Design an enzyme around this catalytic site. Structure first.
Site, PDB file in Angstrom:
ATOM      1  N   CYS A 110      44.774  43.716  40.130  1.00 39.45           N
ATOM      2  CA  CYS A 110      43.665  42.705  40.148  1.00 39.45           C
ATOM      3  C   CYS A 110      44.058  41.263  40.385  1.00 39.45           C
ATOM      4  CB  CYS A 110      42.879  42.808  38.839  1.00 39.45           C
ATOM      5  SG  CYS A 110      43.944  42.455  37.492  1.00 39.45           S
ATOM      6  N   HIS A 145      41.272  41.072  32.514  1.00 38.58           N
ATOM      7  CA  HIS A 145      40.876  41.367  33.887  1.00 38.58           C
ATOM      8  C   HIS A 145      40.544  40.143  34.676  1.00 38.58           C
ATOM      9  CE1 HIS A 145      39.733  43.705  37.118  1.00 38.58           C
ATOM     10  NE2 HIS A 145      38.452  43.761  36.919  1.00 38.58           N
ATOM     11  N   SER A 162      40.114  46.899  41.150  1.00 34.47           N
ATOM     12  CA  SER A 162      40.107  47.505  39.837  1.00 34.47           C
ATOM     13  C   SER A 162      40.243  49.019  39.974  1.00 34.47           C
ATOM     14  CB  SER A 162      38.840  47.141  39.081  1.00 34.47           C
ATOM     15  OG  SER A 162      38.656  47.962  37.941  1.00 34.47           O
TER      16      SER A 162
END
Ligand SMILES: *CC(=O)[C@H](Cc1ccccc1)NS(=O)(=O)c1ccc(C)cc1
Ligand SMILES: *CC(=O)[C@H](Cc1ccccc1)NS(=O)(=O)c1ccc(C)cc1
EC number: 3.4.17.17
Lengths: 247, 33
Positions: A110, A145, A162
């Site tokens: 990511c 994230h 992802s």
């Protein structure tokens, strides 16, 4: 989680430590580690061509082409992140690393997706680009994230990479920054993650020779103790500041 | 003969990535189940 600071080709310590981790987590590792490692020939994987913006593409078309390029690189499941990204490096040097990505064509996770997101969207000044970070809670653990927020012609969206299809790209169809953020929160609800914190960065400048670091956290808000009516306000004030080129 | 190392390592990396992807789906599926 290990990261490769050896460049390309990969030196022997970091290479072996990849097959290290791969043989422990796999229930039948080692049997399969040998089969790849020891095999006279492997197929040479296809090199995806890096996309270039052509006048027949809409902005949504170009955005899908960037996202499809990243999906073809594949999410990195090996356990060894191949391109080191030092968050507070100058933009100039992160862009060098994105060049590495397109020219070496390897799986990515990511964070690296966000850098390459920026690198592929430099050159379209109608698009503004800003990182969105999430800290989430699941089953006694906190997780981190990141995605590339996108703003263009009054619509918000994202690019990202992802393991989960609902926590990456989002089409250019959200009318507020809050609608974007709230989609991610509902997407996280599918996987039983509670969003604890949300960090919104600044617009990333389109100067690819800027030597300033990316701003990752001009806005930080503890969405856990907050109601949606007040998350929206705090997010709506900040998006509008971004648009009025105050922040 | 240094490029050849990249090209081979790329081919092993994608080979391996196929397996960890397929692994992660069985793990996530048996999780749910
Ligand atoms: C940005 C990154 O490396 C993450 C790692 C992560 C994040 C949250 C939860 C677990 C692992 N990217 S991710 O692996 O694609 C990811 C996986 C699972 C969820 C629920 C979100 C993101
Ligand atoms: C089991 C599970 O958590 C998934 C979560 C999910 C994620 C995104 C969109 C919908 C649902 N539920 S499930 O995908 O419906 C599912 C998958 C596999 C099994 C065996 C049961 C349920």
């Amino acid at each position: 989680f290990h990261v490769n600071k050896s460049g390309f080709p990969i030196d022997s310590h970091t290479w072996e430590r990849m097959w290290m981790h791969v043989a422990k987590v796999h229930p039948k590792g080692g049997e399969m580690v040998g089969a790849i490692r020891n095999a006279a020939f492997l197929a040479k994987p296809s090199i995806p061509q890096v996309p270039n913006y052509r006048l027949s593409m809409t902005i949504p078309d170009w955005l899908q082409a960037i996202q499809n390029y990243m999906k073809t690189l594949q999410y990195n499941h090996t356990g060894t992140q191949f391109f080191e990204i030092r968050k507070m490096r100058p933009l100039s040097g992160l862009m060098e690393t994105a060049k590495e990505m397109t020219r070496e064509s390897l799986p990515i996770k990511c964070l690296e997706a966000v850098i390459l997101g920026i690198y592929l969207t430099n050159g379209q000044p109608s698009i503004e680009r800003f990182p969105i970070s999430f800290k989430t809670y699941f089953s006694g653990n906190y997780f981190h994230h990141v995605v590339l927020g996108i703003y263009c012609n009054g619509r918000y969206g994202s690019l990202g990479m992802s393991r989960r299809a609902e926590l990456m790209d989002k089409p250019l169809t959200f009318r507020t920054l809050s609608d974007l953020i709230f989609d991610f929160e509902d997407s996280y609800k599918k996987y039983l993650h509670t969003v604890k914190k949300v960090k919104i960065g600044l617009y990333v400048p389109h100067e690819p020779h800027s030597f300033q670091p990316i701003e990752w956290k001009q806005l930080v808000l503890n969405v856990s103790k907050m109601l949606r009516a007040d998350i929206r306000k705090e997010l709506e004030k900040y998006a509008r500041d971004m648009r009025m080129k105050i922040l | 003969a240094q490029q050849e190392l990249k090209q081979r390592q790329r081919a092993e990396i994608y080979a391996l990535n196929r397996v960890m992807t397929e692994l992660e789906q069985q793990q996530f599926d048996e999780f749910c189940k």
